Ligand SMILES: CN1CCC(c2cnn(-c3nccc4c(=O)[nH]cnc34)c2)CC1
Ligand SMILES: [Zn+2]
């Protein structure tokens with residue numbers, strides 16, 4: 499399933515939507531994981547919050563000014579921490595003449611303006627805010643409590659984060675911490691555009707990045723983990739790196755899969771909610787994740803190897819666990835489909 503590894507979109511009914519982990523297993527049985535990114539449009543009747551007119555007093559403790567340097571589709575993003583601000587203050591800046599979205603008809607025109615102007619007039623990203631916009635009673639796809647096997651770490655990446663975007667705010671090329679999955683919900687506002695590289699081609703993106711930034715690569719085993727590297731889709735086309743693109747709109751979920759490299763940008767004022775999560779398939783990725791060797795987020799895999807792979811525990815502890823990851827294989831939970 500999904501031999502082209504193209505980004506798939508799913509429209510679950512209210513009944514299919516209710517079981518989060520089962521629905522992740524379902525989309526994997528359909529080959530969604532091969533693209534490294536999937537869109538899930540929830541049923542129309544489902545709302546995580548009745549209204550977003552009550553969040554003006556919400557504090558963004560560390561807004562970041564995003565300074566970008568580069569040319570020829572290759573850039574490095576530098577984050578400058580600014581003083582705390584409210585969502586009311588952030589919305590005022592986001593919609594001001596200095597930072598508002600330029601006029602555009604088609605996405606391709608806006609995508610061009612982004613790649614042409616990302617190094618000018620550095621925007622402010624109200625990123626990494628600990629919090630949720632979900633009402634406490636919401637039991638479906640609740641980013642604040644997904645209750646996947648990732649909870650075994652607790653029972654930081656198992657908590658919800660908010661992202662208040664403005665035009666031209668960006669997320670650099672990366673995989674998740676420990677090559678985990680992630681869920682991103684766009685609560686409201688202007689779209690968020692995504693680029694993705696299939697996990698089966700992730701090593702090709704890394705080789706391209708290493709060749710362009712040899713200083714960074716010598717300094718760290720996993721420099722892409724710093725989340726500072728921006729590469730244009732045109733630069734990827736030029737070097738034959740397979741990739742796909744998708745625009746997430748308000749009210750839609752995006753799912754990133756283990757070792758799924760993604761990057762993207764915000765079209766204007768918006769707010770997304772995200773967290774990391776796991777399935778039984780992730781354990782092997784966590785065991786094999788190449789981590790940052792210069793700073794970082796590290797999860798001990800021991801608890802997972804003991805519980806889900808007891809027969810492999812002595813072999814693994816000895817450093818003799820030679821398992822090769824097949825990126826095309828769905829999670830064992832997908833068996834029923
Ligand atoms: C401690 N961890 C640091 C990295 C954090 C992280 C990992 N990935 N990641 C992102 N991925 C996808 C989309 C977005 C986005 O729209 N904005 C900003 N960051 C994003 C953010 C998770 C938390
Ligand atoms: Zn991510």
Ligand SMILES: [Zn+2]
Pocket residue numbers: 717718719720721723724790791792793
């Ligand atoms: Zn590093």
